[PDB]
Amino acid sequence: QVAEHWLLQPLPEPESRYSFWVTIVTLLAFAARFYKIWYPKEVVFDEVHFGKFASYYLERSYFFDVHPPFAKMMIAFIGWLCGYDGSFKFDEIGYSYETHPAPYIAYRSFNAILGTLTVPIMFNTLKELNFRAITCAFASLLVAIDTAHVTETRLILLDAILIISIAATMYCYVRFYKCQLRQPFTWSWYIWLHATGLSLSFVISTKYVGVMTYSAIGFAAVVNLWQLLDIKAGLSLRQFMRHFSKRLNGLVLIPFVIYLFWFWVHFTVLNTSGPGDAFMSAEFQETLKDSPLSVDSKTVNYFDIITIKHQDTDAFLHSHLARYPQRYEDGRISSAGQQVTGYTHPDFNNQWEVLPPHGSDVGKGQAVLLNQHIRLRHVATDTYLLAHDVASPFYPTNEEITTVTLEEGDGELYPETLFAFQPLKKSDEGHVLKSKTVSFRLFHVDTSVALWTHNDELLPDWGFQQQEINGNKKVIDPSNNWVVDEIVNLDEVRKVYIPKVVKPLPFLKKWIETQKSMFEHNNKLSSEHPFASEPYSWPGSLSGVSFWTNGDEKKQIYFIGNIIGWWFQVISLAVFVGIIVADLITRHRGYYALNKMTREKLYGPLMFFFVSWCCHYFPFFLMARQKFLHHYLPAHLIACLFSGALWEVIFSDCKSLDLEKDEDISGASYERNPKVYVKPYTVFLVCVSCAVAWFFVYFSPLVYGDVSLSPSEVVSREWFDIELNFSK
């Protein structure tokens, strides 16, 4: 069998040396991932997605993304262990986790644990392939201190769960293969077969790129089944069919059941209507309950008395008979008009009647539509809401919000009383306004400002320590968001809620529909991200991706590989192809340069990793969606294993005993324990490790985002199509 004599050898070193080196490289990996894990205290890159997909799990709302559910459910499970409710939505990059406390440190720490645990799995993979402890340490170090693997595995991303599942798959398959070489159908053989299947299931349940890991293990499993089918293996067709049926069950059927199990959990957790509904059929949507917000949601009509609540501060739009001071503390002149403030407690001064514009044919009981002109009458003071070209108390650029008498507001000031419930999305213009479910900006028509409030500073004693309400000129700002909370004057007929009757569906019908929608949407979705990259640029790490930027501090997170390291990896791959071509040419000439044991290393573990790297690299030339450096990330874990291995093989006594005789011929004498030139090999590995570590330290400001770089220091790191922020 492939590398049978090599893989059945005892370990080349005592276990204490392996335990020493695995501990050191795991501690380095831990230090690199947990360094300043609380910073940036902001949403980074695809944390905007996975974070949201998690929350929606905690709220039980149905969403739909192009990725299997397992990794998002693992993130959501950490939130659930922290007692997080899903209130924070991660809507944009740069949102403060301090405003809405999402357990972001716990999520980042979970990924940092998985990224750290990848390193000892990689180490133990080479240990089980009978490589030296220093070789195992070096290959694992190339992942422990790679800038791309570090950046990805400390943020709230799926790739930490993907990469550990790929590492576990490679390790479990190597363990299975050693059990297969020693004694097939042992209890240990079954454990490692099903552990390979379980790990393969987690790979494909995280991302569909996991098919490349199935292809790599599938190829190796087929090659070994081909050896077991050979007569010279004395395998009675019945014994061969027993191998085939057990591998089919362990590597295909069981992993497929576990893949379906995650969709069954996903549909059982997500039992309420949500943002995913638009992607599914009406028959699928009939399986979903109504959102708690939609149950209490009532259409807002003209002449309804409403309370309007701010989304970020929970404050109600409020007014009372007190007036703005004729001058603010900075000496600016106010209108001396009636105060409009943000009040956090429900009272009679939160009540606004929604009135149509003067001269409209719109009667009582007609629904208010989004982006229609309206007037708001304060019920307690009998005044119209007004905004004008007077500056607000705290913000000189924002407008003071006040109220005017009915006579003046029906006279010359009529334009200044016109508001609109402006939708957050232009697609939602002309939809019916509903309480609790429809967010809007309260937009002033004449001056083109949105009503806004804040809770970092409260009005002085003349404003009762209430929140300021002002006209923000940055209309698109997400902090300008309001909702109608209650309709106070709701008719008894409009109070009656009719619950939707949830209709059941065949899990398999539900799964087939969602799966078709997943593949159809993954194939579509056409855009041009200022960071898409083609497969030919990945092994060189020629371009990266901006993950986060802070303009005030001139700080940034940039996703890029350890160029020195990824380039060691490449140069290796080329040297190995050269060695294989040279071995094939020399053998075809009757010249047997390489010892049998060197060939078992080359055509066994090194060829297994080389083909596995090919499976994770070449298929991307045949795809056409948007492709970003993360995928060379999986393949880099595999090629780091390969590099360590090939270089150890090189620094070994590779010479055949007799250059005219093929040592592969049965009964030929060959050297069973080729000497490794440990001294020059260790010096070589230390030199490469020091260069990779130097690069990691030099790029560490861009991995962590924690240090501001001068423009000359930024420009000094533009190595290739690398565009960095703050180079000017």
């Binding site: 695809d46 960095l724 922020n725 180079s727």
Partner: peptide, 16 residues
């Protein structure tokens, strides 16, 4: 407003 280089550091798309 200052042009600025690179891009706004965007996310990747999620269907519609």
């Amino acid at each position: 407003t200052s042009t600025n280089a690179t891009s706004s550091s965007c996310a990747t798309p999620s269907l519609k």
